[PDB]
Structure 1
Amino acid sequence: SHSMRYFSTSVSRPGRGEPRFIAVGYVDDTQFVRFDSDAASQRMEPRAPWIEQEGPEYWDEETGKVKAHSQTDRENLRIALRYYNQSEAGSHTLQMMFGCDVGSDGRFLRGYHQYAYDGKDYIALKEDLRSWTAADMAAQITKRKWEAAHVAEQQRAYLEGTCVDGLRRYLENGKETLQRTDPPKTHMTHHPISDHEATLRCWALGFYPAEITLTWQRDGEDQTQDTELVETRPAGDGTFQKWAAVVVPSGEEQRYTCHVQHEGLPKPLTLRWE
C-alpha cells in the first residue's frame, strides 16, 4: 500500500511584493521533488536520488506544470479576496494538496484533490471522484462553476491514471528506498528523579516508514494514563524517531514493558529493563 502526494502553498505578500509559491512532492514519507518561486533556479528540482535520471523533457514538463499552477493560484488568491470581500493589505494563504493511493497489487485505491484558504477547508473532491464538497457559500460558487465544466471528470482521469502511472514508475526506480522497511533500533533508559520514583524511557530510532506504535504496559494492562508520548519526528537522514516515557515507583521497574509495532519487524517487540 503506497501513496503519492503533492503539497502546494501560495502566500500573498502585500507590502513585501508578489506572492510566494512552494510545492513539494512526496512518495510515502520521502520527499522527491520541490519548486520554490522565490528561489533563483525557477526550475522544478529533485530532492531524491532516484528521480534524477528522468529526462530533460520530464524536468521541462514538470517545470511548466508547476509554474502554471503557480500563476493560476496567484489569480485564485485575487478571486478569493473578492469572494470574501477582504482588504488587499492582508496576507492570505491558499493551499492545495492532491495525489493517489495505490494498493499492494499496484492498482488504484484512493484519489485526493483538495483546497484550503487561510487554514479552513474551501472545496474538496469527494472519494467517489464525481462530485465536490463546498465548505461555504463562496466554495459553492466555485463548486457550481466547476460542475458546469466537468472539471471533476478531468481530475478523475489524472488521479486514476497519470498519478498511479508515475507513482508506480517511481516506486520501481526507488525500489531500494521506497520499498524497503528499516526496523526501529530500540533501547531503554533509566532516570531516577527521586529515591521512590524513576523515569523509564523507551526509544525507537532510525526507522522507516514513519508509522510506529510505542506502548507501555504494567502487568499486561496498558498504561496510557501515565505515559508521555512525543510526536514522531524526522531524524534528518530519511529515518524517523519516537520515544515513550513512564514514571515508575522504585522496585516495580520490571513489571513494566515497552511495546513496539513497525512494518519492518517480523513481529512486535517487548522490552524489559535490566
Structure 2
Amino acid sequence: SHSMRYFSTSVSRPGRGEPHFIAVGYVDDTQFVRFDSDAASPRGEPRAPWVEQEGPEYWDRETQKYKRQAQTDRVSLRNLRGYYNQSEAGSHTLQWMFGCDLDGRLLRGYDQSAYDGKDYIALNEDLRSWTAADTAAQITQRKWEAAREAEQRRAYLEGTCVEWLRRYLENGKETLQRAEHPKTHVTHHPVSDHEATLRCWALGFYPAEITLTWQWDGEDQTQDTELVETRPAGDGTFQKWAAVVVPSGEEQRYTCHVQHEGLPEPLTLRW
C-alpha cells in the first residue's frame, strides 16, 4: 500500500507584513517537493532523485500553484479572523493536509484543515459531505456546498492524484518499493545495587512503521516500558528504541520483540 500526501501551513504576522506559506509533499514516507514563501527565490524544488527529470515547465506549473494557494490562504485568515470576531494584533495558523491512498487500486482520499491547532473543517470519507467543528466552520460548509466544492476535490483525489502517484512509483521503484529491515542490538545500564535498564534498539529501517515490545518470560510488559518517538536518521531511514527497568540478576528472563514490514517474521532478542 502506497500514498501521496501534502501538508500546507500559513502563519499570519500582524504588523510584520503578509503571512508565511510553506508546503511539503510526500510519497509514503519519502518527501520530494517543497515551497517556502520566505525563501530568497520562492519556487518548488525537488527533494528526491525521481522528480529531478520532470521538465522545467512542469516545475512552473507546480510553482504557479504553490503561489496560488498562498494567496488563497491570505484571504482565509482574514475571513477566519472575522468569523471568530478576533482582534487584528494576533498571529494565527491555518493548516491543510490531503492525499490519496490507493492491489494497486484506489482506496480512500482525505482532506482536512485546522485553525490555530484545533480541528476546523474536513472532507468526509465519502468525499461528498463535510464535517464542521463549530458555527464558524458552518459558514465555510455553506459556501463549499453551494459552490459544489466537494466534487472538484473528488475529481483530483480519485483522478489526477492517483495518476501521478502511480507514476512516481515507477520512476523511483528502486527506493520507493523496497523495504529496509531494522538492525537491532541490546544494551544494559545498571542504575543502583538492584536495578538495571535494558534498551532494545531499532536502526536503519524503512518504512517508519514499527512495533517494539518487552516481555518477561513470554508475557507482555508495558507497566515499565519507556518508548520514544520514531525519529528520522536524516538519510531516508528511521530509528526507535524501547527501555525497560528490571531487577539485577533477572535480565536473562526478558525478551524484546520487533515487528516490521521488511522482516520475514517477528524478531526475538535477548541481552
Please indicate the TM-score interval, normalised by the length of the shorter structure. Answer: over 0.9
Q: State how 1:118-267 maps to structure 2 within 5 Å.
A: 118-267=116-265
Matched to 1:106, the amino acid is: G
Write the distance in 2 (CA, Å) between the matches of 1:150 and 1:235.
43
Matched to 2:203, the amino acid is: L
Q: Which runs of 5+ in 2 are unaligned?
A: none
Deviations 1:188-219 (A, max 9, x none): 00111123211111000011100000100001
Write the distance in 2 (CA, Å) between the matches of 1:206 and 1:98.
28
Write the distance in 2 (CA, Å) between the matches of 1:107 and 1:37.
35
Write the distance in 1 (CA, Å) between the matches of 2:233 and 2:42.
29
Deviations 1:94-132 (A, max 9, x none): 111111101xx2221111111111011111100100111
SS at match of 1:159: helix
**2:84 aligns to what?**
84
Q: Which runs of 5+ in 1 are unaligned?
A: none
User: RMSD value over aligned CA atoms?
Assistant: 0.9
Compute the TM-score of the two structures, normalised by the length of structure 2: 0.98
Residues 1:2 and 2:7 aligned together: no
**2:66 aligns to what?**
66
SS at match of 2:251: coil
Write the distance in 1 (CA, Å) between the matches of 2:139 and 2:18.
26
Write the distance in 2 (CA, Å) between the matches of 1:48 and 1:23.
15
SS at match of 1:76: helix
Count how many residue pairs are aligned between Structure 1 and Structure 2. Answer: 271
Matched to 1:6, the amino acid is: Y
4+ residue stretches of structure 1 with deviation over 2 A?
none
Matched to 1:94, the amino acid is: L
Shift of 1:40: 1.4
SS at match of 1:71: helix
**2:75 aligns to what?**
75
SS at match of 1:205: strand
Shift of 1:15: 2.1
**1:268 aligns to what?**
266
**2:57 aligns to what?**
57
SS at match of 2:19: strand
With 41-50 and 263-272 compared, the bigger mean Cα shift is at: 41-50
Residues 1:36 and 2:55 aligned together: no
Write the distance in 2 (CA, Å) between the matches of 1:190 and 1:120.
42
Write the distance in 2 (CA, Å) between the matches of 1:200 and 1:135.
44
Deviations 1:229-260 (A, max 9, x none): 11111111111000011111122111100000
SS at match of 1:270: coil
Write the distance in 1 (CA, Å) between the matches of 2:229 and 2:253.
26
Matched to 1:222, the amino acid is: D
Matched to 2:17, the amino acid is: G
Write the distance in 1 (CA, Å) between the matches of 2:247 and 2:81.
59
Write the distance in 1 (CA, Å) between the matches of 2:261 and 2:161.
25
Write the distance in 2 (CA, Å) between the matches of 1:231 and 1:185.
17
**2:99 aligns to what?**
99
**2:12 aligns to what?**
12
SS at match of 2:54: coil
Write the distance in 2 (CA, Å) between the matches of 1:247 and 1:95.
40
Deviations 1:33-64 (A, max 9, x none): 00000001221111111111111121011011
Shift of 1:270: 0.1
Write the distance in 1 (CA, Å) between the matches of 2:193 and 2:201.
23
Deviations 1:43-100 (A, max 9, x none): 1111111111111121011011111011001111111111111111110101111111
Compute the TM-score of the two structures, normalised by the length of structure 1: 0.97
